[PDB]
């Protein structure tokens, strides 16, 4: 199976909703595709589906760089704490890469998750 | 009663490929189901090989087809070697010989410390007018 989680967001809709996750994402995070479709990926920074705030131990500096990289259309790589649906911790080595469309808009961002 | 993974797999919008950037000549270590379905090549046929077989017209042609854009192929080579990103359209072929326009994105993965361990390819297959006739 894939060595990594794969995520595709729609870069044209507001706030990068997920339109696809692969089976490694589902297996490792314990969320199912149907639960996460249309949501922003940031719920992974909250400890389980009932925590309403980002966890203190997710590095706000990395989050902030992710936001910037997305805003500016440029690739990203870094590591931040995430959580499985059962609230258990995940170290997510994350790479984001924009997909440019026919001309010359970003249509998609791809996320690649190496859990380490 | 568990809930299965992969329920919306049929909606995957692109091919995904992973190569081992450490081993020689970027051999493929994973392809997803979109890749298989669109190219007609099934994972067992492609693992261990370089992705360039897709530039040959089907599995019994040993060399890249002359209508594949050799300039673009060169840039791909350069971006991989320089450890940088690539996005471009490239003519490929299904196993059945039919033409494929492959909007390919390559992105390197840096590992623990602190070198490229993988490359991810993302394929958005799009339409062409290219048609090699009956
Ligand atoms: C394609 C894509 C994949 C993402 N994957 C993750 C992820 O796996 N884990 C995570 O914490 N954030 C991920 N994010 C980041 C959040 O969705 C969001 O960009 C981040 O939390 C910063 O924005 P914010 O301050 O508004 O929360 C991803 C973003 C995109 C666009
Ligand atoms: C991760 C990855 C995915 C690739 N995807 C394929 C592809 O789908 N189609 C293709 O023609 N080449 C693809 N390539 C490109 C070839 O493998 C090769 O790098 C390219 O043709 C340039 O090298 P060459 O001139 O030695 O053949 C991919 C390369 C990498 C690293």
Author numbering:
A (entry chain A): 14 to 129
B (entry chain B): 4 to 137
From the study:
A plant called Arabidopsis thaliana has a light-sensitive protein called ZEITLUPE (or ZTL for short) that helps it keep its circadian clock in sync with the cycle of night and day. In Arabidopsis thaliana, three LOV domain containing proteins ZTL, FLAVIN-BINDING, KELCH REPEAT, F-BOX 1 (FKF1), and LOV KELCH PROTEIN 2 (LKP2) act in circadian timing and seasonal flowering. Recent research indicates that their divergent roles in the circadian clock and photoperiodic flowering may enable interrogation of how chemistry regulates PAS/LOV protein function to select for signaling pathways. These proteins retain analogous elements, where an N-terminal LOV domain regulates activity of a C-terminal E3 ubiquitin ligase to target clock proteins for degradation in a time dependent manner. LOV domains are typified by blue-light induced formation of a C4a adduct between a conserved Cys residue and a bound flavin (FAD, FMN or riboflavin) cofactor.
Dark and light state structures of V48I:G80R confirm concerted movement of Q154 that is linked to conformational changes in V/I48. Light state crystals of V48I:G80R were obtained as follows. Prior to setting screens V48I:G80R protein was exposed to a broad spectrum white flood light (150 W), while on ice for two minutes. Comparing the dark-state to V48I:G80R grown in the light, confirms density for the C4A adduct and confirms direct crystallization of the light-state. For light-state structures clear density is observed for the adduct state in two of four molecules. Difference density maps of the light-state molecule indicate that adduct formation is coupled to rotation of Q154 to a buried position. Unexpectedly, rotation of Q154 requires concerted movement of I48 that reorients the Ncap. In the light, V48I disrupts rotation of Q154 to the buried conformation, thereby leading to a predominantly exposed conformation regardless of lighting conditions. Further, the light-state V48I:G80R molecule indicates partial Q154 rotation to a buried conformation that is impeded by V48I. This impediment does not allow robust sampling of the buried conformation under any lighting conditions and coincides with constitutively high TOC1/PRR5 degradation in V48I containing variants.
